[PDB]
C-alpha cells in the first residue's frame, strides 16, 4: 500500500545536498554576486557619460568579431551597456548544472551504489528526481540572488528581473539535457562528453549566427537567453521557448529510465579480442588505450571552434587584440583538459588498480609519467591544432595564408606554460595530500574568476599577478619579452619534481 515510483526522493535529496555543502554555496554565489557589484558597478567609471556609452555601443555593432563572443548591443542605456560582458554567465551556469547532474546520477551509479540504494524501499525514480530537484533549485537560487542584487542598483527594474529569469531558464534547459544524456552509456565520461558536445554545438551556432545576420541564433538554447533582450525592450514570450523545451526533454528522460536495468544504458556490450596486440604491454600503452576517445573528441572540438573564431575575426591594432583574447578561452579549456587527464592517477589509485600495477616491474615514476606525459602531450597537440586551424581560416578569408599562419600559431603556442601549470599543480597535490587531489578543479576555477572579475573590480596589480593567464606575452610587433614564459616553465618543473619526489616516499593505500 502507498507506493509510487518517487518514494524516497526527499531522503536522497537530503544526502545529495550534504555530499556537496562546500561546492554548491560557492558556485551559486560566484555566478550571482558579481553582477551588481562588479559588472554594473564598473560602468560609471569606464563610461562615465551619457554620450560616452554611445560610442562604445557603436563600436560593438560595427565589429562582428567582438559581438561573436558576447552578443549584440541594442541601445545605449546604462543597463544594456553594463551587462553586455555578463552574457557569458549563461554558459558557465550550463557547465555547472551539467556537471552536478552527471555527478549525482551516473558517477555514483557506475561505482556500485545503485544496488545498495534501490534494494531499500526507495522508488525507481527517486535518484533522478533528487538530482533534478537539486539542480533546478540551484539554478533558481543563482538567478534569484542575481536579480535581487541587480534590483539594488540604478538600472531599470524590469531588466533585472528579465536577466534573472533568463539565467534561471538557461540553467534549467541544460539540466534536462544532462538528465537525458545520463541514460545513454554505463560510463560517466561518455555521458559527460555527449552532454558537453550539445553545449559546444549551441555555443558555436550562437557565435556563427550573431557574428552575421543573426537568424541562426534562434536555433540554440543559448540565444533564447539573449533575445529576451533585458534593458532593451523585453521579449517575455521567448521564455516559453526555454520552458516548453525542458518539459519535453525531462519527460523523455524519465521514459528512458522506465525500462533500463539499473547499471546499463541503451546498447548492450560487444565481445572484444582474445589477445593483446604488441602495443599494450606497458604502462604507456595501457594509458594510451584508456585515453584514445577523449583525445580524439577534444582535438576535433577545439579544431572546430578555432575554425570559427578564426573566420569571424575579419568579417591591425584590433585584430591582434581580438586574437589574443579568443585564445585565452582556448587556454582555459585546454587547462581543464590537462587537469581531467591528470586526475586519472587519483582515479586509478582510489580504485585499487595502482597496487596491481606497482606489484610488477613498474616503479612509482614509470607509472606517474604515463598519465603525466599524456596530459602534457594531448593538451599541447589540441592547442597547436586549434591554432593552425584558426590561422588557416584567417589567412584564407584575408587572401594570403603564408603570412598570418606563423603569427597565429605562435599566438596559440605561447599559452602552453599556463596550460601545463595546472597539470603541475595536480601532480604536486598527488604526492603530498592524495585525498585532496580533486581540489585542483577549484584552483583552476579560482584563476578563471580572477581573470574575469579582477581588472573590472579594481584590484591592485599585485593580487592580479596570482594567475598565469595574465602574464602571457603578445606575439606580433613588439610586446614580446619571453621572460614570463621561462618563469612559468620553471614553476611547472619545480611543482612536477616536488610532486614526483613526494610520491616515491609514501604508502600506496
Amino acid at each position: 500500500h502507498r507506493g509510487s515510483g518517487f518514494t524516497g526522493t526527499l531522503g536522497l535529496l537530503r544526502l545529495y545536498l550534504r555530499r556537496d555543502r562546500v561546492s554548491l554555496p560557492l558556485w551559486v554565489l560566484l555566478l550571482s554576486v558579481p553582477l551588481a557589484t562588479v559588472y554594473i558597478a564598473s560602468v560609471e567609471t569606464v563610461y562615465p557619460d551619457r554620450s560616452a556609452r554611445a560610442a562604445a555601443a557603436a563600436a560593438i555593432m560595427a565589429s562582428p568579431a567582438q559581438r561573436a563572443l558576447y552578443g549584440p548591443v541594442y541601445n545605449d542605456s546604462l543597463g544594456a551597456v553594463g551587462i553586455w560582458k555578463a552574457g557569458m554567465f549563461h554558459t558557465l551556469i550550463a557547465v555547472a548544472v551539467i556537471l552536478t547532474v552527471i555527478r549525482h546520477t551516473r558517477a555514483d551509479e557506475e561505482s556500485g551504489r545503485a544496488e545498495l540504494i534501490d534494494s531499500t524501499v526507495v522508488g525507481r525514480y527517486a535518484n533522478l528526481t533528487g538530482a533534478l530537484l537539486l539542480s533546478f533549485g540551484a539554478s533558481i537560487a543563482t538567478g534569484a540572488i542575481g536579480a535581487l542584487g541587480l534590483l539594488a542598483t540604478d538600472v531599470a527594474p524590469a531588466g533585472s528581473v528579465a536577466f534573472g529569469v533568463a539565467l534561471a531558464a538557461s540553467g534549467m534547459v541544460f539540466t534536462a539535457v544532462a538528465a537525458v544524456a545520463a541514460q545513454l552509456s554505463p560510463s560517466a565520461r561518455f555521458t559527460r562528453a555527449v552532454a558537453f558536445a550539445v553545449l559546444g554545438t549551441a555555443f558555436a551556432l550562437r557565435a556563427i549566427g550573431d557574428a552575421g545576420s543573426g537568424t541562426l541564433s534562434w536555433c540554440s538554447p543559448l540565444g533564447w537567453s539573449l533575445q529576451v533582450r533585458p534593458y532593451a525592450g523585453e521579449r517575455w514570450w521567448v521564455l516559453l521557448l526555454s520552458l516548453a523545451t525542458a518539459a519535453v526533454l525531462t519527460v523523455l528522460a524519465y521514459r528512458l529510465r522506465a525500462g533500463r536495468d539499473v547499471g546499463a544504458g541503451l546498447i548492450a556490450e560487444r565481445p572484444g579480442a582474445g589477445t593483446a596486440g604488441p602495443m599494450l604491454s606497458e604502462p604507456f600503452g595501457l594509458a594510451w588505450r584508456l585515453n584514445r576517445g577523449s583525445l580524439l573528441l577534444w582535438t576535433v572540438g577545439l579544431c572546430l571552434y578555432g575554425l570559427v573564431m578564426g573566420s569571424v575575426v575579419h568579417g591591425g591594432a584590433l585584430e591582434q587584440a581580438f586574437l589574443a583574447l579568443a585564445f585565452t578561452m582556448i587556454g582555459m579549456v585546454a587547462a581543464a583538459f590537462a587537469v581531467s587527464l591528470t586526475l586519472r592517477l587519483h582515479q586509478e589509485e582510489t580504485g585499487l588498480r595502482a597496487e596491481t600495477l606497482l606489484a610488477g616491474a613498474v616503479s612509482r615514476t614509470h607509472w606517474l609519467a604515463s598519465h603525466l606525459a599524456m596530459a602534457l602531450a594531448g593538451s599541447a597537440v589540441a592547442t597547436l591544432i586549434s591554432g593552425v586551424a584558426a590561422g588557416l581560416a584567417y589567412g584564407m578569408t584575408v587572401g594570403d595564408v603564408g603570412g598570418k599562419l606563423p603569427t597565429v600559431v605562435g599566438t596559440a603556442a605561447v599559452q602552453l606554460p599556463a596550460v601545463w601549470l595546472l597539470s603541475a599543480v595536480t601532480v604536486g597535490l598527488f604526492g603530498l595530500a592524495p585525498r585532496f587531489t580533486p581540489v585542483a578543479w577549484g584552483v583552476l576555477v579560482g584563476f578563471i574568476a580572477l581573470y574575469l572579475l579582477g581588472s573590472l573590480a579594481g584590484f591592485p596589480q599585485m593580487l592580479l599577478n596570482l594567475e598565469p593567464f595574465a602574464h602571457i606575452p603578445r606575439v606580433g610587433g613588439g610586446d614580446f619579452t619571453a621572460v614570463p614564459l621561462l618563469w612559468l616553465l620553471a614553476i611547472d618543473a619545480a611543482l612536477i619534481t616536488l610532486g614526483a619526489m613526494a610520491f616515491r616516499r609514501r604508502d600506496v593505500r
Binding site: 500500500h1 502507498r2 515510483g5 518514494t7 561505482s111 551504489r113 544496488e115 534494494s119 531499500t120 524501499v121
Partner: protein, 212 residues
C-alpha cells in the same frame, strides 16, 4: 509461497543469461541455491528485487510482480549483495542506522547484540575496513531489520571460520522465529548443516531440485 518463478528468461545481448528457471520457496524454510560460475544466480536475485527486467516468463514475489510493486514489497525483504560496497566517508554505525532509517525500521536490542557478537567496531571510517569487517556491516544491517524474507547472495565471503560459525548460529535463530531465507552458498559445508531442499541450476535452467 513467497517465491514462484515459473519459466523466467533473460538475454542481455546475445548472451543467454537465463533460459527457464523453476525456483519455488515456501514459508519459513531455508532454501539453498547452488550452481557453477555462470548459472544465473545473481541475475535471478536481481530480477526478484526489480533491478533487472525479466524478458519473459512469470515471476511472482510475495504475491505481486517484482517490477511494478518494487517499492511496496521492499518493506519485507533484506538484501545482502555479493560484492559489498559502502559509502567511504560514513562510519560503521552511521551506515547501519542510515540503512535502517531508509528502510524505516530497526531492532536496537538485536542490533547491539549482533555488533557485540560479530565483533564489529562501529567507530571507524568505512574505507579503513579489511573487507571481512566490510561484509559484517551488510550482515549486521540485514540480520537486524524487520524483514521476513532474506535474499542473501553470498554472505560468508571473507569471514574467518569463527565469524562463519557465528553467522550460521544467527541464521538458525532467525529461522526459528519465522524468517525465510534464500541462500546462495558455493560452500557445501554450510549448505549441508543449514538448509534443506536445495536447487541446482547449470546454464540457466534447473537440473536438480529437491529435499536434501
Amino acid at each position: 509461497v513467497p517465491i514462484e518463478i515459473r519459466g523466467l528468461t533473460k538475454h542481455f545481448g546475445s548472451v543467454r543469461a537465463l533460459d527457464g528457471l523453476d525456483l519455488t520457496v515456501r514459508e519459513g524454510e531455508v532454501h539453498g541455491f547452488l550452481g557453477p560460475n555462470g548459472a544465473g544466480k545473481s541475475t535471478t536475485l536481481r530480477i526478484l528485487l526489480g533491478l533487472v527486467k525479466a524478458d519473459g516468463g512469470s515471476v511472482r514475489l510475495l504475491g505481486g510482480d517484482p517490477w511494478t510493486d518494487a517499492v511496496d514489497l521492499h518493506r519485507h525483504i533484506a538484501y545482502v549483495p555479493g560484492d559489498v560496497t559502502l559509502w567511504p566517508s560514513l562510519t560503521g554505525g552511521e551506515t547501519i542506522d542510515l540503512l535502517a532509517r531508509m528502510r524505516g525500521g530497526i531492532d536496537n536490542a538485536r542490533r547491539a547484540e549482533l555488533i557485540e557478537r560479530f565483533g564489529l567496531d562501529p567507530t571507524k571510517k568505512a574505507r579503513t575496513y579489511s573487507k571481512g569487517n566490510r561484509q559484517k556491516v551488510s550482515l549486521i544491517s540485514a540480520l537486524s531489520s524487520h524483514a521476513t524474507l532474506l535474499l542473501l547472495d553470498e554472505p560468508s565471503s571473507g569471514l574467518d571460520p569463527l565469524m562463519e560459525n557465528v553467522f550460521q548460529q544467527c541464521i538458525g535463530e532467525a529461522r526459528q522465529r519465522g524468517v525465510t531465507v534464500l541462500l546462495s552458498s558455493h560452500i557445501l559445508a554450510e549448505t549441508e548443516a543449514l538448509c534443506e531442499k536445495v536447487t541446482i541450476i547449470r546454464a540457466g535452467k534447473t537440473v536438480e531440485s529437491g529435499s536434501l
